[PDB]
Structure formats: structure tokens, C-alpha cells
Amino acid sequence: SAVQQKLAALEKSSGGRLGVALIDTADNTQVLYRGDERFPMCSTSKVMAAAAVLKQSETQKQLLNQPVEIKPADLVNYNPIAEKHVNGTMTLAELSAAALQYSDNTAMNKLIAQLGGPGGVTAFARAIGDETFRLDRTEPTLNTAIPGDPRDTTTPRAMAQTLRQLTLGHALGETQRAQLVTWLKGNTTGAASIRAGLPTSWTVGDKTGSGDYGTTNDIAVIWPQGRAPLVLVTYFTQPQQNAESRRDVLASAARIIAEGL
Numbered sequence: 001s002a003v004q005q006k007l008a009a010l011e012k013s014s015g016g017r018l019g020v021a022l023i024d025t026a027d028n029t030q031v032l033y034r035g036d037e038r039f040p041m042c043s044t045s046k047v048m049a050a051a052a053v054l055k056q057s058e059t060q061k062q063l064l065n066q067p068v069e070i071k072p073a074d075l076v077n078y079n080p081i082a083e084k085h086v087n088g089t090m091t092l093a094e095l096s097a098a099a100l101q102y103s104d105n106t107a108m109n110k111l112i113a114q115l116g117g118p119g120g121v122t123a124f125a126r127a128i129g130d131e132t133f134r135l136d137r138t139e140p141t142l143n144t145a146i147p148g149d150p151r152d153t154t155t156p157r158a159m160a161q162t163l164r165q166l167t168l169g170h171a172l173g174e175t176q177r178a179q180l181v182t183w184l185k186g187n188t189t190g191a192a193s194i195r196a197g198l199p200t201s202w203t204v205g206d207k208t209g210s211g212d213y214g215t216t217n218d219i220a221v222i223w224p225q226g227r228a229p230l231v232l233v234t235y236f237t238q239p240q241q242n243a244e245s246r247r248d249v250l251a252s253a254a255r256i257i258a259e260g261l
């Protein structure tokens with residue numbers, strides 16, 4: 001299609017490897033580019049950890065209000081919110097929000113611990129029908145994004161389907177789904193990524209990711225004004241370990257997708 005030709009051209013111009021999956025929930029049509037290739041998730045994996053904790057809260061009704069102590073040893077490489085609460089506590093809701101809206105890595109590690117390790121996050125993916133997602137490591141090493149390494153990867157197709165189920169479907173209870181959507185819509189890290197390629201009037205909830213090898217990711221639910229929502233996953237990684245982030249590629253891919261509608 002026109003869109004696949006434009007995405008291939010964008011990829012060629014960028015020097016890296018681009019993966020895209022769009023689900024249009026109007027007709028459940030899909031647009032895929034490298035849709036079944038594995039990409040390092042980096043921080044887009046935080047959506048799965050937060051959703052797994054939300055799923056737990058369907059039975060443990062007060063779980064999100066449980067205080068979790070932030071100790072100095074807990075701090076890793078990027079902890080914008082957790083740093084503000086060292087030697088104090090954050091609730092699981094606050095940690096989930098921090099992981100999602102600020103990409104706080106300490107928050108992610110506390111969520112992983114709550115789930116019993118990376119295998120607990122992966123188990124939740126399996127439980128909602130995602131056979132592709134795998135979380136193997138904690139922060140910060142899950143961002144190494146080594147070419148060919150299957151650890152901490154998923155495919156665009158799988159992540160788009162899972163994000164659809166979590167936000168628009170019923171993998172979560174009604175209050176939990178609404179909470180997740182609220183958290184994603186409040187993301188603070190996404191302005192230069194998918195959002196930048198879309199009409200300013202569209203509502204977007206997204207989670208970015210970045211890692212080594214210039215890995216630059218964003219996964220989004222998009223609510224166009226007067227139109228069924230869309231789920232868009234854009235993964236990008238580069239051949240040089242020290243490559244710079246390329247959020248503009250994700251913006252451009254979103255723009256190309258949006259043109260085709």
C-alpha cells in the first residue's frame with residue numbers, strides 16, 4: 001500500500017529499523033510494518049507491569065493504596081519521582097503513575113517486585129493472551145537493546161493487540177481500565193513522539209521508551225474527535241550502540257499513518 005511504501009522510505013531515510021502496528025478499531029483493520037519482528041521494548045514494558053498490578057487490585061481492592069518504602073538502595077539511573085520520596089513511601093498507585101507518566105525506573109522495579117519478578121510480569125501477558133511479550137530483566141539493564149537479543153522484547157503486532165485489550169477491551173476490570181487510560185493520557189514524556197505527528201485535536205494516551213542502540217519507542221491509544229479510536233505502536237532501533245534517539249521518526253510514522261485515514 002501507499003502507507004507501507006512511505007513507511008519503508010521513512011525507514012530507509014532514517015538508517016535504522018522501524019516497526020509499526022496500527023489497529024483501527026472502527027473495522028478492526030491492521031496496518032503492519034515489520035509487525036512480527038522483535039524489538040526491544042525498553043520503557044514501553046512499564047505498561048504491562050502497571051496493568052499487572054491493576055489486575056491484582058481487582059481482588060485486592062485496597063492494593064493500590066498500599067505504601068511501599070523507597071530506600072536509597074532502590075534508586076537506579078532515572079528516578080524523577082522516586083527521588084522525591086527517598087526515605088518515605090509511595091503507594092502502588094503513585095508508583096504506577098510514576099512509571100507510566102514519568103518513566104520512573106525505580107517505580108518500575110517496585111512494580112516488578114510486587115509481581116514476584118520479571119516472570120510475574122510475563123505471566124500476566126500470557127494470561128491475557130500475549131504469547132510474544134517477554135520481560136527478562138529489571139531496570140536499568142532491560143534497556144540494553146542489543147541487536148538480536150530476544151530478552152525484553154515484543155513485536156509491534158503483539159503489543160498493539162495487547163494495548164488494545166488493556167485500554168479499549170476488557171482484559172482489566174472497568175475501574176482498572178479507566179485508571180490505566182487516565183494514566184496514559186497524562187503521560188508527560190510523549191510530546192515529541194507519536195503525538196507530534198498527529199492533529200493537535202486528537203486525544204492521545206501513550207508510553208514512550210528509549211534505550212541503547214538509539215532505541216526510540218512509543219505505544220499509543222488515540223481518540224480522534226468523532227471517530228473510533230486507534231492503537232498505534234512505533235518501535236525504532238539503530239545499528240550503533242551509542243546512536244542518538246530519533247523521536248522524529250516516530251512522529252513521522254504517525255503522520256504517515258494519519259494521512260492514510
Ligand SMILES: *[B@@]1([O])O[C][C]([C][O])O1
Nearest residue numbers: 042043078103209210
Ligand atoms: B525507559 O525506556 O524510559 C526512560 C527510562 C530510561 O532508562 O527507561
